[PDB]
Amino acid sequence: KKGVSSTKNGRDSESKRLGAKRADGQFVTGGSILYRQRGTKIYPGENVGRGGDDTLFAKIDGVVKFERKGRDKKQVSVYAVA
Amino acid sequence: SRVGKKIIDIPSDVTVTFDGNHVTVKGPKGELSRTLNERMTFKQEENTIEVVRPSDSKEDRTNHGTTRALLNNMVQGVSQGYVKVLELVGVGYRAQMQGKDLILNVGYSHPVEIKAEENITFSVEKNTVVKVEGISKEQVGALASNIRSVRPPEPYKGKGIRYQGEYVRRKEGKT
């Protein structure tokens, strides 16, 4: 049609699929991922590596336990009982 | 819609007989029939009466008062005379009496004439004390209240048909 003019703000980011990938009670692999985050919402505990981007992995295979960490924070405790 | 302080409706020597739904004013001066109502059962013990109010419905209690006040108008007018006194003035245009009639030189094409009524006494004392004696309010009270409107007192001069309790007003006479 007629004059419609310059126009700017349609800018956003091709997203990323963050958060968790596995859950309570579930059994895992060695290089298995347990979470994709940024910062520390949760804190790796037992048998847990933390890669560069705050990604957490379990150092072993085994099953999980999320739990509190502090008085008000949270962590992981992988166990490979079998 | 506030009328019910008086609901007595007592007869007189004039006799309130019946003709069915009709009801007849008779006696010394009477022989005029008219229907009171249907549900409003009227009754006279010896010489006292009052409209029975069956159920006092909206319609029934309005008809109570109709029949009460209208039979009161009857025993007022057919017995005594529904007598209403009034006066008359007609000025410049030659509004002239004719006894039981009148003429106006309104002075149109044709000056135009006026007449009297029937069964109602137009008793003229001095050509401006006219008594209108009849039988009731609905029709002859309508006569008394329409003769005033026949040629009513026009304000800015004051000529027309007046009651004994009427007056003339004026107008902001600005063409």
């Binding site: - | 819609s1 506030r2 009328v3 609905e138």
Partner: protein, 37 residues
């Protein structure tokens, strides 16, 4: 007095009476009682 939207009497000896059935008010306040919801 000088005319209004209406006339300007107010009195309330309000003869809200039917004349043989025609409802009206023989009164001085036509300003308040209308229909209503």
């Amino acid at each position: 007095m000088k005319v209004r939207p209406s006339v300007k009497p107010i009195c309330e000896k309000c003869k809200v009476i039917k004349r043989k059935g025609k409802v009206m008010v023989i009164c001085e306040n036509p300003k308040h009682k209308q229909r209503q919801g």
